Amino acid sequence: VLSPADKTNVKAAWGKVGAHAGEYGAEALERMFLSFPTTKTYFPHFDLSHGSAQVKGHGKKVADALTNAVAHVDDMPNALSALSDLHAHKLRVDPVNFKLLSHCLLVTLAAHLPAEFTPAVHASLDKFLASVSTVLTSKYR
């Protein structure tokens, strides 16, 4: 459960990402695929090499979805229903994979936002990402 502090911390930090969100998105995916190569199994016919436009494209989708989450931080179950359909109903992603990508997003954010990635903000981003994850991994139709 996010605190009120947690919500503003997440809005502020993610607000700073601005129109580089697709780049943060793609870098977190690249970090995931390299650090944890079992995660690649979910993308069986992607090009997952260093340059890949496909990873880039996908990263922007992920990053935009998170921006949508941040904008609807109070009612994420309703906001993210279609993505829960995809990840829990269709794809059946093991939740461990969401911890892996969440960790990689945190690392991406630490590397690019060193003023903003304080201990308190790190704490909120982690809680936020865990909450997003829970929603995308739940069947609640």
Binding site: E27, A111, H122
Partner: protein, 146 residues
């Protein structure tokens, strides 16, 4: 842990810039702030009620120094982490009963602290290398549960 030449030089080149009196206290501090139940293991350290309190707790900083010390030790013995960490594994598992999930969590907060300090030098392959190290350490520290 097998590191590649490129990986190994990358890890060590970054490790060389780590301020060994501060970075350990940082990582431990973030553990206590991001995963607050870990505070219970350090009830003896006094005020941990606040992120600033935590991060400025001199016993946190002191104790962090020792945990980084152990990771530094680890870097010289990547091929015998279990042996090297045997005494510590007994302390943490048999005596404190730390849930081993928390060893993985600290490994990961340390990785976040590295990236925080080194920014664009903490490239995806450099991270992947550090993941192998922190996973090695956590598993070695958990050995007595296995």
């Amino acid at each position: 842990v097998h590191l590649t030449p490129e990986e190994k030089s990358a890890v060590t080149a970054l490790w060389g810039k780590v301020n060994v009196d501060e970075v350990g206290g940082e990582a431990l501090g973030r553990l206590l702030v991001v995963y607050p139940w870990t505070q219970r293991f350090f009830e003896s350290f006094g005020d941990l009620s606040t992120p600033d309190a935590v991060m400025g707790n001199p016993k946190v900083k002191a104790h962090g120094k020792k945990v980084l010390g152990a990771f530094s030790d680890g870097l010289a013995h990547l091929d015998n982490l279990k042996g090297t960490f045997a005494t510590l594994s007994e302390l943490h598992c048999d005596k404190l009963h730390v849930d081993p999930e928390n060893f993985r969590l600290l490994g990961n907060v340390l990785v976040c602290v590295l990236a925080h300090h080194f920014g664009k030098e903490f490239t995806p392959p450099v991270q992947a290398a550090y993941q192998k190290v922190v996973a090695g350490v956590a598993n070695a520290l958990a050995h007595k549960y296995h």
